[PDB]
Design an enzyme around this catalytic site. Structure first.
Site, mmCIF file in Angstrom:
data_model
loop_
_atom_site.group_PDB
_atom_site.id
_atom_site.type_symbol
_atom_site.label_atom_id
_atom_site.label_comp_id
_atom_site.label_asym_id
_atom_site.label_seq_id
_atom_site.Cartn_x
_atom_site.Cartn_y
_atom_site.Cartn_z
ATOM 1 N N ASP A 1 0.861 -1.199 0.000
ATOM 2 C CA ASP A 1 0.000 0.000 0.000
ATOM 3 C C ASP A 1 0.890 1.240 0.000
ATOM 4 O O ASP A 1 1.007 1.915 1.025
ATOM 5 C CB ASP A 1 -0.989 -0.084 1.149
ATOM 6 C CG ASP A 1 -2.054 -1.132 0.918
ATOM 7 O OD1 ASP A 1 -2.309 -1.452 -0.257
ATOM 8 O OD2 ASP A 1 -2.607 -1.620 1.890
ATOM 9 N N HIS B 1 -2.898 -2.050 -4.917
ATOM 10 C CA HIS B 1 -3.975 -1.096 -5.267
ATOM 11 C C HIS B 1 -3.385 -0.182 -6.329
ATOM 12 O O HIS B 1 -2.832 0.880 -5.995
ATOM 13 C CB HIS B 1 -4.434 -0.281 -4.044
ATOM 14 C CG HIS B 1 -5.279 -0.999 -3.053
ATOM 15 N ND1 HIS B 1 -6.511 -1.533 -3.371
ATOM 16 C CD2 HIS B 1 -5.095 -1.225 -1.724
ATOM 17 C CE1 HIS B 1 -7.053 -2.056 -2.281
ATOM 18 N NE2 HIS B 1 -6.192 -1.878 -1.253
ATOM 19 N N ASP C 1 -6.238 -5.729 -5.839
ATOM 20 C CA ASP C 1 -7.345 -5.659 -4.849
ATOM 21 C C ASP C 1 -8.372 -4.623 -5.313
ATOM 22 O O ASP C 1 -8.650 -3.679 -4.565
ATOM 23 C CB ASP C 1 -6.737 -5.355 -3.488
ATOM 24 C CG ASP C 1 -7.659 -5.515 -2.302
ATOM 25 O OD1 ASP C 1 -8.650 -6.279 -2.375
ATOM 26 O OD2 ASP C 1 -7.329 -4.933 -1.260
ATOM 27 N N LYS D 1 -11.636 -4.988 -5.969
ATOM 28 C CA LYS D 1 -12.969 -5.080 -5.397
ATOM 29 C C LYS D 1 -14.048 -4.666 -6.412
ATOM 30 O O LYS D 1 -14.890 -3.800 -6.176
ATOM 31 C CB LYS D 1 -13.069 -4.240 -4.112
ATOM 32 C CG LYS D 1 -12.066 -4.687 -3.043
ATOM 33 C CD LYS D 1 -12.436 -4.131 -1.673
ATOM 34 C CE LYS D 1 -11.653 -4.826 -0.582
ATOM 35 N NZ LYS D 1 -12.077 -4.308 0.714
ATOM 36 N N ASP E 1 -19.707 -3.857 -9.621
ATOM 37 C CA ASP E 1 -20.659 -3.220 -10.557
ATOM 38 C C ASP E 1 -21.381 -4.319 -11.320
ATOM 39 O O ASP E 1 -21.150 -5.508 -11.069
ATOM 40 C CB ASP E 1 -19.931 -2.211 -11.442
ATOM 41 C CG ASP E 1 -20.755 -1.015 -11.872
ATOM 42 O OD1 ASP E 1 -21.972 -1.187 -12.186
ATOM 43 O OD2 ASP E 1 -20.180 0.094 -11.883
ATOM 44 N N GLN F 1 -10.652 0.036 10.596
ATOM 45 C CA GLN F 1 -9.876 -1.228 10.487
ATOM 46 C C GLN F 1 -9.746 -1.850 11.879
ATOM 47 O O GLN F 1 -9.496 -1.118 12.850
ATOM 48 C CB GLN F 1 -8.523 -0.995 9.837
ATOM 49 C CG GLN F 1 -7.653 -2.240 9.713
ATOM 50 C CD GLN F 1 -8.202 -3.240 8.722
ATOM 51 O OE1 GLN F 1 -9.345 -3.671 8.858
ATOM 52 N NE2 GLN F 1 -7.382 -3.618 7.744
HETATM 53 O O1 LIG Z 1 -23.960 3.113 -9.871
HETATM 54 C C1 LIG Z 1 -24.522 2.896 -10.980
HETATM 55 O O2 LIG Z 1 -24.741 3.832 -11.761
HETATM 56 C C2 LIG Z 1 -25.125 1.544 -11.266
HETATM 57 C C3 LIG Z 1 -25.756 0.857 -10.234
HETATM 58 C C4 LIG Z 1 -26.627 -0.187 -10.525
HETATM 59 O O3 LIG Z 1 -27.329 -0.726 -9.644
HETATM 60 N N1 LIG Z 1 -26.857 -0.538 -11.804
HETATM 61 C C5 LIG Z 1 -26.188 0.021 -12.808
HETATM 62 O O4 LIG Z 1 -26.480 -0.305 -13.968
HETATM 63 N N2 LIG Z 1 -25.258 1.037 -12.595
HETATM 64 C C6 LIG Z 1 -24.468 1.647 -13.680
HETATM 65 O O5 LIG Z 1 -25.355 2.369 -14.543
HETATM 66 C C7 LIG Z 1 -25.042 2.107 -15.910
HETATM 67 C C8 LIG Z 1 -26.189 1.354 -16.569
HETATM 68 O O6 LIG Z 1 -25.929 1.386 -17.955
HETATM 69 P P1 LIG Z 1 -27.011 0.779 -18.990
HETATM 70 O O7 LIG Z 1 -27.441 -0.613 -18.551
HETATM 71 O O8 LIG Z 1 -26.205 0.777 -20.275
HETATM 72 O O9 LIG Z 1 -28.180 1.766 -19.076
HETATM 73 C C9 LIG Z 1 -23.733 1.340 -15.914
HETATM 74 O O10 LIG Z 1 -22.636 2.241 -16.112
HETATM 75 C C10 LIG Z 1 -23.671 0.688 -14.553
HETATM 76 O O11 LIG Z 1 -22.299 0.564 -14.182
HETATM 77 O O1 LIG Z 2 -9.474 -7.068 -0.052
HETATM 78 C C1 LIG Z 2 -8.699 -6.719 0.880
HETATM 79 O O2 LIG Z 2 -7.504 -7.046 0.853
HETATM 80 C C2 LIG Z 2 -9.262 -6.095 2.132
HETATM 81 C C3 LIG Z 2 -10.476 -6.559 2.628
HETATM 82 C C4 LIG Z 2 -10.841 -6.287 3.941
HETATM 83 O O3 LIG Z 2 -11.842 -6.812 4.471
HETATM 84 N N1 LIG Z 2 -10.022 -5.569 4.734
HETATM 85 C C5 LIG Z 2 -8.910 -5.016 4.262
HETATM 86 O O4 LIG Z 2 -8.169 -4.409 5.051
HETATM 87 N N2 LIG Z 2 -8.501 -5.197 2.942
HETATM 88 C C6 LIG Z 2 -7.298 -4.562 2.375
HETATM 89 O O5 LIG Z 2 -6.143 -5.116 3.017
HETATM 90 C C7 LIG Z 2 -5.221 -4.083 3.361
HETATM 91 C C8 LIG Z 2 -5.107 -3.975 4.874
HETATM 92 O O6 LIG Z 2 -3.991 -3.148 5.122
HETATM 93 P P1 LIG Z 2 -3.491 -2.904 6.638
HETATM 94 O O7 LIG Z 2 -4.663 -2.512 7.526
HETATM 95 O O8 LIG Z 2 -2.496 -1.778 6.432
HETATM 96 O O9 LIG Z 2 -2.785 -4.181 7.109
HETATM 97 C C9 LIG Z 2 -5.727 -2.814 2.700
HETATM 98 O O10 LIG Z 2 -5.067 -2.618 1.443
HETATM 99 C C10 LIG Z 2 -7.207 -3.048 2.513
HETATM 100 O O11 LIG Z 2 -7.628 -2.330 1.354
#
Ligand SMILES: O=C(O)c1cc(=O)[nH]c(=O)n1[C@@H]1O[C@H](COP(=O)(O)O)[C@@H](O)[C@H]1O
Ligand SMILES: O=C(O)c1cc(=O)[nH]c(=O)n1[C@@H]1O[C@H](COP(=O)(O)O)[C@@H](O)[C@H]1O
Lengths: 256, 256
Positions: free
Chosen positions: A36, A60, A89, A91, A94, A207
């Site tokens: 990180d 990241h 990482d 995550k 969407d 955390q």
């Molecule tokens: O946060 C968002 O906008 C999102 C949330 C969700 O529940 N559903 C969802 O479709 N979206 C986003 O909204 C857009 C939907 O696009 P269309 O399906 O092409 O109309 C995409 O860019 C998705 O990433």
């Molecule tokens: O997906 C992950 O790694 C993640 C999930 C989670 O539940 N908790 C979590 O801390 N992390 C990630 O793991 C790392 C934890 O870092 P430290 O708290 O510095 O040890 C960070 O980069 C977070 O983004």
């Protein structure tokens, strides 16, 4: 309970999981470094010095100030040299149509360099379907986030059960979990646990830490993910060795 | 029920929400364009041509092949010219310490150009705390994802109630929701609804569509988010006008 080396040979093992389990047993490491940092030079100096101590380097890519695909070329060279996997990482969280583009494209081209990525299960199985349309052809794996380390996490009870079902129904691509504990009874699935430090405590933004002995030994996870416990230490190599030895012994004592 | 113009003046309104509600009423638009394109030139040509028709342009900066901070400089010029907000649909979903760096830093510097971002509530309130430590000083707002449009979404029941509580406890920074419906009874909070098309259907990766009349008129949301319904059309300006008129009339008929 099978050794990491025996798990690497299970009939239903994913190739990425097999590669990881083999190098964990060869190197006696179940430590994932959470690199990180915001500087490419620091990321690469950590990867080179700590490479021998780790099974995996977690990135990241979106906090790196000087990201270029060439930085990731240098990271892959170190991963090959020292034998560790690269885990972005990201995550993903969407709809399937969106995550496929976020995984393959943009500036980061994550699928081109990341052995592993992770995804939240909250959007439903379309997140996995979308990722797998990029990741399967590129021989990649994915971890599903079944439990989280942070205060107020909603990834409990039925949510965690849904993550396990989703993983087990997409075993062609899903190789394991981010979790605080063993959540799957199937030994083909890796459990990686963040929120790990030797000392009790937390940070100012939710955390929470548990020890390697607690999460590997008592809670039955496979791999510890450690960021600040190593990164903030003066001697990051000796810190990595302390975490490696802690996680490895906890694993051995659970095997008996 | 208050008009958008009256909601813009509510005592507890966030400044970003007020700015948005004012320009929605001035322009007679409650349409958010989901500019789901990979080319900067296409993003900017859409923003310029559709700017007058939209209250907001939603970006996925991480699918843009030729992202530079200069592209976002050109987008801000268009947002100011045509009067719309920029919403980066990043779906922050990590621990607070991580999301603060993902929001401020890396290549994208999202907080420097995005009026609005969104976050998942699954990690607990630390995700909001982390974002707000960057966003409050930069006079930004955040949307919490209370419901999702995709098949198998786990954002239901107690999850949705937790998102609403989190928003209401962080009203200094949280200005509303991504949702399928009105989820908060407090009129200071915006409801933005994706998964919108005029025609019934879905995609191959779990997206489900409802009409503007259904989500604004029957389900009580404020703003429709539309991607492919506009982007895949030949004449994206006339498509945007169809969606604008649909969402605006649905809003007016609910006001009576
Ligand atoms: O946060 C968002 O906008 C999102 C949330 C969700 O529940 N559903 C969802 O479709 N979206 C986003 O909204 C857009 C939907 O696009 P269309 O399906 O092409 O109309 C995409 O860019 C998705 O990433
Ligand atoms: O997906 C992950 O790694 C993640 C999930 C989670 O539940 N908790 C979590 O801390 N992390 C990630 O793991 C790392 C934890 O870092 P430290 O708290 O510095 O040890 C960070 O980069 C977070 O983004």
């Amino acid at each position: 309970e099978l050794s990491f080396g025996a798990r690497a040979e299970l009939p239903r093992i994913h190739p990425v999981a097999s590669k990881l389990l083999r190098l964990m047993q060869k190197k006696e490491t179940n430590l994932c470094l959470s690199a990180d940092v915001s500087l490419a030079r620091e990321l690469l100096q950590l990867a080179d010095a700590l490479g021998p101590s780790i099974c995996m380097l977690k990135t990241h890519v979106d906090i790196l100030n000087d990201f270029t695909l060439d930085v990731m070329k240098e990271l892959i060279t170190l991963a090959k040299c020292h034998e560790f996997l690269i885990f972005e990482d990201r995550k993903f969280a969407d709809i399937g149509n969106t995550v496929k583009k976020q995984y393959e494209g943009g500036i980061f081209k994550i699928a081109s360099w990341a052995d592993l990525v992770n995804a939240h299960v909250v959007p439903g199985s379309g997140v996995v379907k979308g990722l797998q349309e990029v990741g399967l052809p590129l021989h990649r794996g994915c971890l599903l986030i079944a439990e989280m380390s942070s205060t107020g996490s909603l990834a409990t009870g039925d949510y965690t059960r849904a993550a396990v079902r989703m993983a087990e129904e997409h075993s062609e691509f899903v190789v394991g979990f981010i979790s605080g504990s063993r959540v799957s009874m199937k030994p083909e699935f890796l459990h990686l646990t963040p929120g790990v430090q030797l000392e009790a405590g937390g940070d100012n933004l939710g955390q929470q830490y548990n020890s390697p002995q607690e999460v590997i030994g008592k809670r039955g996870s496979d791999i510890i993910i450690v960021g600040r416990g190593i990164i903030s230490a003066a001697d990051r190599l000796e810190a990595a060795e302390m975490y490696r030895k802690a996680a490895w012994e906890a694993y051995l004592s659970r095997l008996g």
